[PDB]
Design a protein around this ligand. Structure first.
Ligand SMILES: O=C(O)CC[C@@H](O)C(=O)O
Ligand SMILES: [Cl-]
Ligand SMILES: [Mn+2]
Ligand SMILES: [Mn+2]
Ligand SMILES: [Zn+2]
Ligand SMILES: [Zn+2]
Length: 453
């Protein structure tokens, strides 16, 4: 009883009919899978996207990783695929003194949790993690070169992870702001023990991960409802990770044994994802894991209509924590409203409900700041400002609906929750900067209603 493996997460094997629409399928399994945080999806047996690449022309800059439980790592920050693969196979082979396909997955798991907890061991490994570029592209077929019929079959698949974030049931689709770190797929070259620390996705989005080829990836996941339980356990064991961070490039994360969570009554599930299988993580579902050997995976974030209310809650949670946003949720909502006529109807219906809450909150906030003595106001096109020029001084939220400025501190803004935090001038010197009047906003919401019918 060194390591007691968590119970297995749900595994789905959709029929071709079920599989034909990824968003319908994800909606269908949600009641089950949101209880476990992660789930595994095996596509129909003949869904087999062709993979092809020259192992000598693909190069990438590896990240180095120390394997110590509870030690701080930063979430985001030269080999060819062949030379990495050679290093990776030799590492595993020498570590166990065995051929690679002979090392049992149970053993690699048990040994991982041993080595990260033992101070005397100092194993370091390497891995790749980068968004698709011309130097290293998607593992799925994309359009340009002369493609074979096989590749053409998979070009428009919903499960082709390049398409997932442009589909009609997707919400993150119409965002015009630059969120490239979030809407483009990431490519991951793994090796034995290379690991991803406990985290949730930005803005509590979904993620979906496809293992193109190689040895399995071992996952642990925690359902969304238990996120704060996990954070409380982790805060007690590693408070350093929870100090305020200067930006998004300084997110601190760590390796932590799932048995520790289970001891503290945090529900945790596991799975081994093999080549050709999907793993899906649900909103605010903590997950971590490690690779069993040399492999190649591809993952992307996405947001469904189910996620919309959670996205709003997330930004509220970021504000309470003074965490930076990747994008403005309200700006996304208003962009969609301005495109109501071309929106999918269920999407239009869900956006309308979120917009109604947005407007009612904004109404109350503006009444409050008026009572504080802010009188002067001027329209402002917040979406034109670079993000770093429209973050609240206090809580760092990305402003869009409104903010307060003072001629006293040129360029500085606070959101309407932090009117007292801008400067020492009396509020009558302040200006309310707003994107829309309430009277602009109600017709926008009405367009959505008409589209939703
Ligand atoms: O985070 C990683 O490094 C692996 C990707 C995983 O977190 C995912 O959400 O697909
Ligand atoms: Cl160690
Ligand atoms: Mn993730
Ligand atoms: Mn505060
Ligand atoms: Zn603020
Ligand atoms: Zn001032």
């Amino acid at each position: 009883s060194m390591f007691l493996p968590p119970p297995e997460c749900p595994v789905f094997e959709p029929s071709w009919e079920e599989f034909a629409d990824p968003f319908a399928f994800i909606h269908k399994i949600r009641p089950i899978a949101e209880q476990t945080g992660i789930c595994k999806v095996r596509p129909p047996p003949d869904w087999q996207p062709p993979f092809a690449c020259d192992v000598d022309k693909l190069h990438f800059t590896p990240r180095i990783q120390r394997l110590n439980e509870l030690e701080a790592q930063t979430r985001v920050k030269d080999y060819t695929l062949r030379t990495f693969g050679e290093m990776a196979d030799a590492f595993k082979s020498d570590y166990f003194n065995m051929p690679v396909h002979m090392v049992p997955t149970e053993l690699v798991e048990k040994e991982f949790w041993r080595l990260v907890s033992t101070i005397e061991e100092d194993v370091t490994v390497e891995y790749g993690a980068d968004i698709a570029s011309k130097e290293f592209g998607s593992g799925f077929p994309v359009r340009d070169i002369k493609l074979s019929p096989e590749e053409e079959e998979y070009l428009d698949s919903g499960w082709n992870l390049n398409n997932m974030p442009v589909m009609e049931q997707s919400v993150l689709a119409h965002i015009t702001a630059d969120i490239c770190g979030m809407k483009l797929p990431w490519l991951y070259v793994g090796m034995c023990f290379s690991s991803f620390c406990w985290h949730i996705e930005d803005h509590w989005s979904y993620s979906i991960n496809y293992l193109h080829w190689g040895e399995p990836k071992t996952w642990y996941g925690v359902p969304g409802y238990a996120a704060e339980q996990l954070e409380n356990v982790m805060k007690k064991l590693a408070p350093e990770l929870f100090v305020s961070q200067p930006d998004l490039l300084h997110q601190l994360v760590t390796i932590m044994n799932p048995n520790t969570l289970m001891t503290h009554e945090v529900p945790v599930y596991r799975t081994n994802q093999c080549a050709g299988e999907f793993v899906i993580t649900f909103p605010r579902a903590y997950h971590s894991g490690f690779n069993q050997g040399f492999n190649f995976a591809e993952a992307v974030n996405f947001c469904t209509v189910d996620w919309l209310p959670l996205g709003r809650q997330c930004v509220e949670h970021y504000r309470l924590l003074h965490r930076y946003c990747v994008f403005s949720h309200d700006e996304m909502i208003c962009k969609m409203a301005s495109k109501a006529d071309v929106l999918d109807v269920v999407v239009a219906s869900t956006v309308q409900k979120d917009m109604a809450i947005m407007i009612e909150d904004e109404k109350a906030l503006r009444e409050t700041v008026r009572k504080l003595g802010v009188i002067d106001s001027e329209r402002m096109d917040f979406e034109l400002l670079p993000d770093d020029e429209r973050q609240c001084v206090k809580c760092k939220t990305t402003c869009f609906m409104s903010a307060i400025s003072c001629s006293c501190k040129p360029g500085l803004l606070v959101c309407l929750h932090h009117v007292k935090e801008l400067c020492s001038c009396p509020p009558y010197k302040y200006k309310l900067r707003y994107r829309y009047t309430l009277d602009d906003l109600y017709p926008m919401m009405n367009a959505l209603k008409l589209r939703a019918e």
